[PDB]
Amino acid sequence: AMGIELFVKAGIDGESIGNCPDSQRLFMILWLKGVVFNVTTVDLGTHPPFLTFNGDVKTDVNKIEEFLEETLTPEKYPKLAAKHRESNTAGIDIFSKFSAYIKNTKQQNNAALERGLTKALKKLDDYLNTPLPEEIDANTCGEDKGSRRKFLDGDELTLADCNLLPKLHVVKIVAKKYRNYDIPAEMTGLWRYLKNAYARDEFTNTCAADSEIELAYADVAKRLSRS
């Protein structure tokens, strides 16, 4: 861990964190590992974020994630992988559903696309509200016999969170700005998940500005013009 330089996307200001979920993903991982590293916002354009370890460039985001978990190990660094297989697949279809929802221009399809995103969101809400086996044994579940854990896998942030949280945040900001869509408040688990993230510095200080995210989708998202 002698040399760790992280190159994330830069915002319109040229210095701030720009909208790039993959960037926030790796940023959060390094932060949660407690390792010494440097961040440099650069104009990556369409190029993905990357990092250099001891001068050697690392590429991909999934491959970079595997390297960091395999290199920064106990006892000096905490293992950040999720213990439950289900935690790594919750909400995987959300971003895809959201993108098709906000990229649509025909009003005749809006309703269906919206239900698509909502259903994807409810599945994620369901997992977060269903107590994990540990909580059931521990009797760590609420009076509603409902899960009250803070994140996907448990009460500690994991690689699954570093991957999902940035996309989920983007979905919330953009879908609201360009469709006036709100993640229903009845999805108590999902909202409790999001609020917990906003309380942790590792997500807050690695997060792009609401205006930055919105401006980023100004061309991507389309207005429901055609019937």
From Swiss-Prot:
Coiled coil: none
Presence of the UniProt keyword Membrane in the record: yes
EC number: 1.8.-.-
Keyword Membrane recorded: yes
GO MF term set: chloride channel activity; oxidoreductase activity
Motif G-site positions after renumbering to this chain: 20-23
Transmembrane segments: 22-42
Regulation: Inhibited by F-actin.
Biological role: In the soluble state, catalyzes glutaredoxin-like thiol disulfide exchange reactions with reduced glutathione as electron donor. Can insert into membranes and form non-selective ion channels almost equally permeable to Na(+), K(+) and Cl(-). Required for normal hearing. It is necessary for the formation of stereocilia in the inner ear and normal development of the organ of Corti. May play a role in the regulation of transepithelial ion absorption and secretion. Is required for the development and/or maintenance of the proper glomerular endothelial cell and podocyte architecture.
Family label: Belongs to the chloride channel CLIC family.
Assembly mode: Component of a multimeric complex consisting of several cytoskeletal proteins, including actin, ezrin, alpha-actinin, gelsolin, and IQGAP1. Interacts with AKAP9. Interacts with TPRN. TPRN, CLIC5 and PTPQR form concentric rings at the base of stereocilia and may form a complex. Interacts with EZR, MYO6 and RDX; the proteins may work together as a complex to stabilize linkages between the plasma membrane and subjacent actin cytoskeleton at the stereocilium base.
Name listed for the protein in its UniProt record: Chloride intracellular channel protein 5
Native species: Homo sapiens
Gene that this sequence comes from: CLIC5
Region of the whole protein represented: 175 to 410 of 410
